[PDB]
Amino acid sequence: SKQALKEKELGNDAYKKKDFDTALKHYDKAKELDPTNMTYIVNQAAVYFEKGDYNKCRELCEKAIEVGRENREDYRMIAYAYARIGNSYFKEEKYKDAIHFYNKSLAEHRTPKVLKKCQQAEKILKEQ
Amino acid sequence: MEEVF
Ligand code: NI
Ligand code: NI
């Protein structure tokens, strides 16, 4: 399971080139070798986010959150997942929805990044 | 892009 790490990193590197189906496939190899690890699933959510499939992205976030809780993952990661859902809504200019999910994120593990992003969502909401 | 971990 230095194997799973290697699959994950090939996945990440591909994702970063916008080589999305390749990333997905390696994330899948990763999950197979190591299915208690939510990380692969949230990364997949990143992929769909960038492909611009916001619905599928939220679904994988939700799945990643389930997996993480079930397997007692870092709260931080659960928070990232929630914040990613928030981001998908932000992309869609559904700011009440974005903010709600940032709040969920913040309730799991408060991070400045998410706070700031939430507050800019608040501003957009407020100023029209 | 969204961060991957
Ligand atoms: Ni080696
Ligand atoms: Ni709710």
Ligand nearest to the CA of A3: 1
What's the CATH number where A63 sits?
1.25.40.10
Residue A97 Cα to ligand 2 midpoint, Å, equals: 9
3-state helix, strand, coil in chain B (%, to 5): 0, 0, 100
| Distance spanning both ends of chain A, measured CA to CA | 50
Residue recorded with tokens 């799991």: A108
Technique that determined the structure: X-ray
Q: Which amino acid is at B2?
A: E
Work out the minimum CA distance from A40 to partner chain B, whole angstroms: 8
Neighbours of A77 (CB within 10 A): 20
How far is A52 from A88, CA to CA, in rounded Å?
9
Backbone φ and ψ for A72, nearest 5 degrees, come out as 60, 55
Count of the separate structural domains present in chain A: 1
CB A24 within 8 A of CB A47: yes
For residue A53, the enclosing domain spans: 1-128
Q: Which of B2, B4, B5 sits opposite A87 (nearest CB)?
A: B2
Residue A100 Cα to ligand 2 midpoint, Å, equals: 7
Verify whether the Cβ–Cβ distance B2 to A46 is below 8 Å.
yes
Helix/strand/coil (H/E/C) assignment for every residue in A75-104: HHHHHHHHHHHHHHHHHCCCHHHHHHHHHH
Residue recorded with tokens 């700011």: A95
Residue A2 Cα to ligand 1 midpoint, Å, equals: 9
CB A68 within 8 A of CB A78: yes
Residue recorded with tokens 């870092």: A74
Would you say the C-alpha torsion A51, A57, A63, A68 has a positive or negative sign? Answer: positive
How far is A81 from A4, CA to CA, in rounded Å?
21
CB A26 within 8 A of CB A14: yes
